[PDB]
């Protein structure tokens, strides 16, 4: 299968550069277009421009001109797009894709990479806090989880290490205190939970915060 | 450049009905007896989905719902049984001309029959007010349709200062949405008051739905 998988998220300082990989599996490397693609917090998509791994040609788009450098390793299968002196306003999702190359195939990008989340900001990366939220001191009960003032993007929550998936509200983070804050909610039946455990599971790779939180009746 | 204007930019439509986005190109996009209109699919947090390719052809693996026409400068994207799944924004795509150019995208919502939110107001958790803050956080689950207005009293006055939002995505499952409220204090600010209370005004009920606690 057409796999194509880029490099995790990134935190960079303004004025820096930020060089994102796009490595390919299933296909011949040589003999297909890399497209590379934006997309702002909220907005739409923007094309960057094209390389061919088979000679090295590239496009660029004109508003990209002088800050996108295409790149490619046959030697590995991998695409690069290097990005220089980046602005606050360059944090985007950077995609990588595969265009169709046969007649009648209208050069539709049909295979896209996860995308690359870019941050620009001299802000530290922060560990978050992480609460219980327990009902107040029905058929049905509901739980929370809070994530607050973590910096950069992501973080993953689960409960009950994912085994617990169904009944579950996690909402995108807002911007609190010039840092992240969510939150999760998970419903169960009344009968279920003050009587069995119920945890949510906290990671924020940045920071390297690995924490569980037992959700605990309030006194 | 070719510029591609979507319509509508926004667009609902009710289970298994027929959903229609247009495309017009500023500039033909069809090149000799080819055509280079594409369309994808993105839902949120993840990367765009091809759909249909050279303006008419159904790309593998994506459902015969999924359909388009038109030439020249004009398209169309057709969806018939629109699907709790559909829930997604579309675009459509020029890859005649470099620079290559998308479309601004159309936001399809799935109607579904109207939901109360199911409330619930959560005190500061301890391990925050030995840290010195004080969360309140009000959960308002499984609603619809998505306009819904938060209230947040204090001691019966109304409080707008220190309150923020946070919205989900239309469930690809049942159609609905969820909202988080917090309203966030100092620990001093949190204990010089009692009542604290997350009013939801929404469409289902004249009254607004009230959960309310009593520091103590």
């Known amino acids: 299968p057409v796999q194509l998988q880029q490099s995790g998220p990134e935190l960079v300082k303004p004025g820096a550069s930020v060089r994102i990989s796009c490595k390919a599996s299933?296909?011949?490397?040589?003999?297909?277009?890399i497209h590379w693609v934006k997309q702002r917090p909220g907005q739409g998509l923007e094309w960057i421009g094209w390389?061919?791994?088979?000679?090295?040609?590239?496009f660029y788009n004109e508003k990209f001109k002088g800050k996108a450098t295409l790149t490619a390793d046959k030697s590995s299968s991998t695409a690069y797009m290097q990005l220089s002196s980046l602005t606050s306003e360059d944090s985007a999702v950077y995609f990588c894709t595969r265009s169709y190359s046969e007649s009648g195939q209208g050069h539709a990008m049909d295979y896209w990479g996860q995308g690359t989340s870019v941050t620009v900001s001299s802000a530290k990366t922060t560990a978050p806090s992480v609460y219980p939220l327990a009902p107040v001191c029905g058929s049905s009960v509901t739980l929370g989880c809070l994530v607050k003032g973590y910096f950069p993007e992501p973080v993953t929550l689960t409960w009950n290490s994912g085994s617990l998936s169904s009944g579950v509200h996690t909402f995108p983070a807002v911007l609190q205190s010039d840092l992240y804050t969510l939150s999760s909610s998970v419903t169960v039946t009344s009968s279920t939970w003050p009587s069995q455990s119920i945890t949510c599971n906290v990671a924020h790779p940045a920071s390297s915060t690995k924490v569980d939180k037992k959700i605990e009746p309030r006194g | 450049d070719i510029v591609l204007t979507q319509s509508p930019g926004s667009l609902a439509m009710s289970l298994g009905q027929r959903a229609t986005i247009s495309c017009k190109a500023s500039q033909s996009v069809d090149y000799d007896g080819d055509s280079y209109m594409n369309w994808y699919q993105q839902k949120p947090g993840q990367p765009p989905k091809l759909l249909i390719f050279?303006?008419?052809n159904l790309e593998s693996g994506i459902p015969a719902r999924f359909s388009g026409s038109g030439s020249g400068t004009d398209f169309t994207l057709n969806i018939h049984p629109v699907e709790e799944e559909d829930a997604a924004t579309y675009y459509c795509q020029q890859s005649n001309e470099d620079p290559y150019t998308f479309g601004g995208g159309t936001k399809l919502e799935i109607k579904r029959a109207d939901a109360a939110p199911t409330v619930s107001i959560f005190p500061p958790s301890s391990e925050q007010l030995t840290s010195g803050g004080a969360s309140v956080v009000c959960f308002l689950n499984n609603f619809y349709p998505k306009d819904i207005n938060v209230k947040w009293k204090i001691d019966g006055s109304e409080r707008q200062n220190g309150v923020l939002n946070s919205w989900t995505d239309q469930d690809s499952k049942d159609s609905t949405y969820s909202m988080s409220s917090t309203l966030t204090l100092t620990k001093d600010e949190y204990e010089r008051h009692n009542s604290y209370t997350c009013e939801a005004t929404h469409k289902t009920s004249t009254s607004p739905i009230v959960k309310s606690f009593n520091r103590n």
């Open positions: 390389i061919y791994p088979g000679d090295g040609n590239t």
């Open positions: 050279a303006a008419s």
């Open positions: 299933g296909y011949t490397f040589t003999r297909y277009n």
